[PDB]
Amino acid sequence: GYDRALSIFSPDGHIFQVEYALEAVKRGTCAVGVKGKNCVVLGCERRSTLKLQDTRITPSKVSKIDSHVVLSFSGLNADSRILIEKARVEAQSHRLTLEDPVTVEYLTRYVAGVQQRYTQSGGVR
Amino acid sequence: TSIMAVTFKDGVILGADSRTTTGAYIANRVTDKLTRVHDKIWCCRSGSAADTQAIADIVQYHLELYTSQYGTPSTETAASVFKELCYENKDNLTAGIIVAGYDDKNKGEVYTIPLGGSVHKLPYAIAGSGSTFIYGYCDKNFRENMSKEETVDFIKHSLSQAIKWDGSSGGVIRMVVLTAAGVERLIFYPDEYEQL
Amino acid sequence: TSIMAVTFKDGVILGADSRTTTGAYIANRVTDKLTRVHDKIWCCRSGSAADTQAIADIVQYHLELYTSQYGTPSTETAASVFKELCYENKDNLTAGIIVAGYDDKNKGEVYTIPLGGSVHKLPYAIAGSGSTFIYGYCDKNFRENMSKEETVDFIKHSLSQAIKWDGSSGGVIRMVVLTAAGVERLIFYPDEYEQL
Amino acid sequence: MDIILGIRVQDSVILASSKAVTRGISVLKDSDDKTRQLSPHTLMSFAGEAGDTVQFAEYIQANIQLYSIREDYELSPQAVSSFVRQELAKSIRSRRPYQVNVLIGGYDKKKNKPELYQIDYLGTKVELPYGAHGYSGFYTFSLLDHHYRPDMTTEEGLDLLKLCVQELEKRMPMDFKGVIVKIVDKDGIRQVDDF
Amino acid sequence: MDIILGIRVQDSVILASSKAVTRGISVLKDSDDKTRQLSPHTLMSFAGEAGDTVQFAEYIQANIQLYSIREDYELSPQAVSSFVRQELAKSIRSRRPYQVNVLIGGYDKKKNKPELYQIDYLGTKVELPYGAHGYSGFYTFSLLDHHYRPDMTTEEGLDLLKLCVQELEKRMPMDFKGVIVKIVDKDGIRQVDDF
Amino acid sequence: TTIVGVKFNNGVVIAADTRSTQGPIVADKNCAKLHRISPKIWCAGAGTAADTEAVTQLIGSNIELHSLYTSREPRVVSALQMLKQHLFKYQGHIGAYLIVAGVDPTGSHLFSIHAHGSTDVGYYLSLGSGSLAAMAVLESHWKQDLTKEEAIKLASDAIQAGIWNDLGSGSNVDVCVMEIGKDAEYLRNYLTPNVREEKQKSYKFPRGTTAVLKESIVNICDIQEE
Amino acid sequence: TQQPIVTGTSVISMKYDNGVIIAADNLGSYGSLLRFNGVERLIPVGDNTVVGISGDISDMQHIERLLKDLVTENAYDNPLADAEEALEPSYIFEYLATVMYQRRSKMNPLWNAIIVAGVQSNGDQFLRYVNLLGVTYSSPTLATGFGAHMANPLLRKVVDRESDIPKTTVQVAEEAIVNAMRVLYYRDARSSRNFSLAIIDKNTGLTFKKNLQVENMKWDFAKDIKGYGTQK
Amino acid sequence: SDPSSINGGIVVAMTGKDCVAIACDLRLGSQSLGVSNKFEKIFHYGHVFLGITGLATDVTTLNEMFRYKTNLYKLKEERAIEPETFTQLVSSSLYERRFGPYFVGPVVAGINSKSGKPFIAGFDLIGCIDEAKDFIVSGTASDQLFGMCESLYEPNLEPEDLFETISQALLNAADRDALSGWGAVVYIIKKDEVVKRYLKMRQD
Amino acid sequence: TTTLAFRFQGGIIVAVDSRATAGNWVASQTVKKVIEINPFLLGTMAGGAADCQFWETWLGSQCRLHELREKERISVAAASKILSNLVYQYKGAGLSMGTMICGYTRKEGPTIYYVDSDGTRLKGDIFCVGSGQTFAYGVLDSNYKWDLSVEDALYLGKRSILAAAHRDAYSGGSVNLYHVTEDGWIYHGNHDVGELFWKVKEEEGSFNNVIG
Amino acid sequence: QFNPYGDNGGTILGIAGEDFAVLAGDTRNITDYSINSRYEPKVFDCGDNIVMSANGFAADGDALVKRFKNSVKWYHFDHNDKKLSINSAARNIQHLLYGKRFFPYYVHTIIAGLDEDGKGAVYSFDPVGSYEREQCRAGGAAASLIMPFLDNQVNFKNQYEPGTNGKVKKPLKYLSVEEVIKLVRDSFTSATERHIQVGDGLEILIVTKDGVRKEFYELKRD
Ligand SMILES: [Mg+2]
C-alpha cells in the first residue's frame, strides 16, 4: 500500500501540508457561529458566482450530525462529506453503546481526532 | 495363536504355540493348546479361551458317554459334536477349532471348524491369528503321504514362521502325534526353532 | 493388492498384481501398479489409488526438477521426497509405497514407506493386503545376491501365492527389472503362474 | 421471547407483545417491552433467542436512525422491511446466526396506508393483514380469519386483539404475564397503557 | 401433572392441588381434581406421568376400601402410608414402574392428631409438617419455613397456603389454572369451594 | 446411468443412455450425457450431474485457453491431468465420475477418472449404476483390432444391457465416434428403442372447464414513449 | 441376528426347451481370504432337482442336512417313494421358502440366497428363488449376488421372455451359462476358476458335472497397458 | 428440518404451438401452519419468466439476485436477456454455492425473441440443467405433477388449450399435497402478449 | 387431523375432518374419523388409524357383551374405562391413540371422555384433538354456550373444523357431522371443505384475507 | 445388524364400477436397481369372487395372501360353505394385519369384488390393519403419480361445465368396464414413463357377477 509520509516537519519546525490545508480553508465561503443565552445560530455565505443553481437539491452548507447537533464548514466541499459521514456514524455508535446521545464536546473531540490522525499517517493528506 | 494339524502316511500330527495374551501382556507363555477329547481324538483351540475350554469339556463328556454305549467314536463323529455346539450357539461363541484323530479303518483325518460353525474335511488345516502369515509357505510345502520325520519338520518350520511374524504367538512349539503305535508328545524350545 | 521389490546381484526388480477393486467388484483387472518416477527409480503403490497417484505425480515432478539442476538423483533422495509427502500429510493420506531404484555407485536399493510415513531400507520389501499371506514364504526363500532368473522366479512364486489367497489381488503379474543394461518390462498370465 | 401479534386495520397497525422474561426456572421480569422504534412511523417487535433479540433489534434501530440522519428522510415501511429481511437472510448462513423473528408495523405517509410485515429468522418475508410468530398464530388465526375486516377501526382492532389474548390466556400452558400494546398510525407511535 | 402442596396444622391437614391438564400444546382441562379419598379420614393427592397417576391412585383406593370392608375398621394414616410406600418401592424395580408422586393427608382418630406423609415414585417416605412434589417446594418452602407454627388454626393454614399459591403464580412459568383445596380433620374430608 | 468407452482400429468410441433420475423418479427421458471437452475430446459423466457438467466445462474452458496459448490442438492427457488434480484437491466432494476419450496428434486415448482423483487406462471401460451390466457385454464380445463398425455395435449393445437391466438407466443410446484424421461424429439418439405407445384416450379438455377468478394483461414491454 | 462368516458367491441358472441348467463355483471365502477351495454348493435332491446355495456356508451345511432328512422322511411308509410320490422340485422349494420366512420372522435368519432348479412330473421346467428374507420369485433366468448384476443381462439375451424358451436348445443354454461363469471370474473378487454345473432334462435326466474350469481367457491385451495416464 | 419442504409450494412449465405456459401455487407456510396465500413464485425479467420453489428466504433472495444481474446485463448488452442465456446464468449462479447451496428448485420459461422458438428448463439446487421439450416440474408435489403432466400433455397445443392442460395439471397435483395450494396463477406466454390468470381452487 | 366433541343442552356434537397424510403426501380425503361403536356410542379417530379402528370396534363388542349380561345399556363411564384400561396394559409398546368416547344415557346425561394411549381418561365438556386442534378450540371457546340450539351447535362444530381445515396443512377434505341424543346418534352428512369454504365465506363474511 | 424387511417395488390399482370391479398391478419385481422378474404375478384370485394384492415387501405380501386364502377355506369348513362377502373379508384381513401390530406385515393391501347388492367394491388397508371402502385406490411405488390423475378423470375434480365458469360442476356420470380399463392402461403407461420400478407388464383382474376374468398388456421393459 501507498505509505509515503506527506505530512513532515521542515527545518523551522513547520508541517507545510497542514499549513497549506489552512489555506484551502481561507479560500472557502465564510461560515459564522454565535451563541445566545438559549440558542446557537449558524450563518453561511453562498457565493453568487453560480446562478441557474437548483437550490432544492444542491448540498446545503449546514449538516445535522444528530437531531441535537449540527456541523458547518469552510474549505473543500468533498473533504467535508467524509468528516460528516464519520461524525454521523460515531453519533449512532455512541447512542448504541452508551445509551445516550453525544455531547457537543465529545463529537467535536472525535472529528478533531480524525483530522489530527490524517496529519501523521502515511499515504494521506 | 498359531495352530495346525497335518495328516501323513502313518496318521496325523497336531501342532501349536504356547502364548496366551491379554492385549500386549503375555498372561501365559507355556500354555497347552493341544487338548484331548478322546484317546486318539485331539483338537487345537483358537478364539476365546473360556469358550473353547467350555466346548472341549462338553465334547469330552459327549464322547465319553458315546464310548460307554457305542464303542470308540470316529473322528467324523467328534467333528460333528464340535460343529453342533459351534453352529447352534454361533451368536454367543468365538471359537475356531481344528479336530484331528486316528482310526484304524479311516487312518489320519483332519476337520476344521471356523467361526460360523461350518465343517471342512481337509488333508491339513491351519488356524489362529498366526496362520495368515503361512498360507503361502504351507501350500507350497505340503505333500500327501509324508513320513513322521517330514511332517514334524513341516509343522516345526511352519509354526516357526507364524511365531516369527505374529506377536500373539510364541513360546514353545508343542506337538501331539497320533498313530497306530499310540500317542506321543513333543516339545521344541526357542533356541531350536528360531535358528531354522 | 500384492506388491514387492527385491534387490539382486545385478540390481533390483519390482513386482505387482493387476487387480483394483471397489468392494467386491473388480473395477480394473489389468491395472499397472508399477509407476515410473525417474528413468531407473520406480515405485509400487498400495492404499488409496487417488492418493498414491497424486503422490507419485508430485515426486516425478520433484525429481524432474532435481535432475535439471543437480543431475540424476539417488534412490535414497527419491525415498526422502516420498517420505516428506507421506509424513507431513499423514492425517489426510492412505498410502503404502515401496521405492526401488538402480544407481551405478549404490547398485540396487529398496526402501519401504508404510502408512505412518517412516522409512526403512531393506534387502527386499513386501506390501499390500496380499503380502500378509507370504511373510513366511518370502522370509524362508529370500537370499542375497540372487541371479536375474532366480529373482524373477522368487517374485513370480511369491505373488502367485498372494494372488491365490487374497481376493483383492489378481489378474496378471507385472514386473520391471532395473539394472545397468536398462529397463525391462515383464508380464506373466494366469495360465502360467496358477500352475506353479 | 414468546407471544408477538400484529393486526393491520383501516388506518393503523397494532402490535401486541408479552411482558414475561423467563430464565428456565424463574420468571425474572413481568414488565419487559419487546419492541424498538426504528423511525417515527415504524415499530418492530421481536422474539427468539435470549440476547440475540435485543442485540439484533438495537442494531437495526441504529442503522435506520443513521439513514434518517444522512438523508433527512424517513424510509417507507416496505424499504425498512426489505433491509431487515436481507440482514436476516445474510445471518442464516453466518458462523452463528441471529435466532430472531420480527414483526414490522409501519404507517406509509406517502401512500397513507398502514402496513404489517412478518419476517422470521431465515429471512422469510410476507405482507399480511394480521400475523404472528411461534405458536401464537395456532391459537389466534381462526378468530382473526372469522372477524377481520379491512375497514375496521382502531377500536374494533383492539377488541379483536383482546379476544385473541383471552384465547391465549385460556389454552396456552405458559404464563406470559399479559401484553404491551402499541398503535402505529399517521401521528406516530403510542402505547395503550390499560390492557 | 404439576403442583401439589400439603400442610399439617394444629387439628387438620390441608392439601392443595392444581386444576390444569396439559397435553403438550393445549390445556385440555382447567377443573381437574388430582385427589382420591382412600378412607373417610384419609386423602391422597398425586402427580406424575399421564395415565399412571389415576391408575395408581384408583388401585390404592380400591385396596384400602377392600381392607375397610374386610375388617370393618379404618387403617391409621401411618399404616396406609406404609402400604403405599411398599407398592411404590415394589414398582421401581418392575418392568415398567409407576411414575407417580403422592401426598397422604390423614387425621388419626386414635391419637387425635393430623398427619402428613410425602412419598415419591421411588418409595421415599417422610412425615412432615408441610411438603410438596416437583418444583413446588422450591418456591414455597422459604415462606413455610418462616411463618409455620405447630399450633396454627385451619384458617391460618389456609392464609399461609394462599401466600404460597400467590408466589407460585408470580414466579412459575406454567399456568396451572389455580388449585383445588381440601381439608382433612376429625369430621372427615371437605372441599373449600372458593379459593 | 450407463456409460461405456471402446478403443478400435483407428480411434475410440464413447456411448451413454439418456435417462436422468431423482431417486426413483425420471426427471428427464432424453438427457444428454456425452459432453464435449474440446472438438475431438469427449467425455461421459456419472454421479452428481451438476458436478460432471461443471468440471467438464471448467477443464474444457481451460483446455481451450491452453490450446490458444500453445498453438497446439488439445491432448487427452492434459484434460486427464487437469481433471484429476482438481478432483483430488476437493477430496471426493465433487462427485464426478467420468470416462474420457479422444484423438490428438499423439494418437487415440481412453481413460476413466473417479471422484477422489484416481485415473485408469483401458481398451474398454464402463461407469455408472449400469456399469456391471455393460461390462458383462464388453467382457463377452471385446477383441483386439476391432473395426469402427464393430466398436459402435459393441458400445451400443453394452448401453442396451444397461437400459434393459439397470433401473437407473433407460430410453435412448447416444454415441460419439472419434477417429484419427477425421472430425468427431456425435450421433445423438443413435438408437430409439423406447418410444411410448399411443394412449387409449385424448385428455384435451373443453374450453371453459377451469374456473377463473381474474384475468389481466401482463406488461412485458418497456416503458413506452409519448 | 448374526453375520455371515464363511461365504459362497453367485449361483446362476436358466430355462431351455427341454429343461433347466444351474451353476456355482467351488470357493468358501473368509472375508477377503480365499480360505476353502473345494466346496460343493450345488446339492442334488433325487434325480429331478438341484438346489444351488450362496451366502453363509455353515447355514448351507445345515440346509443340506435338512434336505437329506427330507428324502429320508418322504420314503417313510411310502411304497411310491421312487415313482408317483417322489419329491418334486416344487415341494422342495415350498419347504425351503417356508423355513426361510419363519427364520427371518424370529429375527434369526439362515443367511443365504437359494435357487431351486428342476423338472416336474409332467415335464414342466421349474426355476424359483428364495433368500434370507423369505422373498420369492420366478423368471426364465435367475441368479444370486454378483450373478444378478452380470450373469442375468447375458442370459436374458438368449431367453428374454417365455416364448424364447422352446427356441433355446441345451447346447446354446450351456454355452451361455459357461460364458457367464467366465465373466464372473473376470469381475468378482470373491470368485474362483473351479465350478460345478448341473443339467436337469425331461428326456435325459440329471447330468452333474464336477471339476469344470474357466477356459479361453483373454489376458494378452494386458501387456500393452502401461501406467495410469501419462507413463509410456 | 429438511430445508426444501419447510415452506411448501410448486411450479410447472409447458410448451405449446408458438407458446409457453408457467404456473405456480400461492401458499407459504411454516410446516403445518399456513402463513400466506399471496406468495407468488413466478417472476419475470423482460420476456424471460422464472419460477422458484423451495426455502422461501432463498426464493426471495434469488429473485433479487437475478433482478440485480439481468438489470446489469441489459445496461451492458443493450438488449433483454434471452431464455437460453438466462438458463446458463441460473446454473452458474447456483453452482458457485456448491458447498453451501440455496435450497431451491428453479424453472425457466420463455420464447426467444429472434427465432420465435418456445423454451423451458429446470434445475436442481446446485445448478444441473434439465432442458425438456415437453414439460418441467418442481416443488413438494413434484411426483404428483410428473404423473399429471405425463398423461395430460400432448405436443403442439394451441394457447387456450394449453391453459386448460397446465391448469388441471397444477390443481389436481396440489390437492394431493398438504404443503401446496391456497390459490394458483397461470401465465400464458406468446411472442408479444402475456396473459395472467388466477384460478379458483379449494382453500384447505 | 382435527376432531372435536362438545356437550350442550341438546346432547353432544361430534365433528371431524377427513384427511389422512403420509408425510406431505395426501393418502386420502375420504377417511371416516368417527367410529360408530354402536347406535348409541361414538368414538373419534386421532393418532394411529388402526389402533383407533381396531380397539373401538373391539369396544363395541365388549359393550354388546355387557348389555347381554347385565340387561342394561352400558354407561359412558364404564365403556370409556374398558378402553382406557386396555390401552394402559399396552403402555410402552407403542400404541397411538387420542379419542373422545361420546354417549348420552339416563343416569349420566350427555357425557364425553377423552381417552389416550398413555392411559389418560378425562371427563369434560369440550375436547379437541389433532394437528389442527388449536384452531378449532379458538372458534369453540369464543362461541360456546350450554343453551345452544341443535341447529346452531351443529353449525359451530362444522365451522370449527373448517377453521382448522383452512389453516392446518394436514386437515381437510370434508366435514362429517354427528348429533348424539339419548335415543342414539344422528348423522348430519358429509360436507366437502372446498365447497363449504366458499359458501361460508359469502354467507358469513369471514375469511376476508382470501380472494373468492 | 439384520434387517428383516425389504422393498420389492411394484404398483397396484383398484377401481370400483357400478356392477363390476377391477384390480390391476404391474408384473415387475425388483430389489434396489436390479430386476428379479419381468413377470411375477401380484394380483390373486382368492375364491368367492374376491381378488387381492398385498404390495410392498413381497415375503410379507405372499404370507398375507396365503393366510387369507386359508381363511376363506376355513370359513367354508366352519360355516356350511357360506360365501365370504367382501365386507366380511375386509374385517377378517384387519385382524390378520393387527395380529402383527408390533412386528407388521410391511405391505399395502387392496381387495376388490362385488358387495351383497351386486355393486362394485374396493377396500384399502394400511400395514397394521386400518381399512376403508373406496371407489378408487392406487398403491405402491407410483401411487403418488396415479391418484391425482384418477381424482381428475374418474371423479372429475376441478372440472366444471363450460359457460358457467366454476358455478356448475361436471356431473359424475357412470363409467363402463371398457372405459375403466382405458384409464387403468393410461395410468400404468404414464407411471412406466416416470417411475423406474414400474414396467414390463400389466395384469388386470376384472370381477363381475359372471366371475373373474384376466387381461394382460405389455409395458416398456427399460
Ligand atoms: Mg485372487
Ligand SMILES: [Mg+2]
Ligand atoms: Mg393442497
Ligand SMILES: [Mg+2]
Ligand atoms: Mg388444510
Ligand SMILES: [Mg+2]
Ligand atoms: Mg419404468
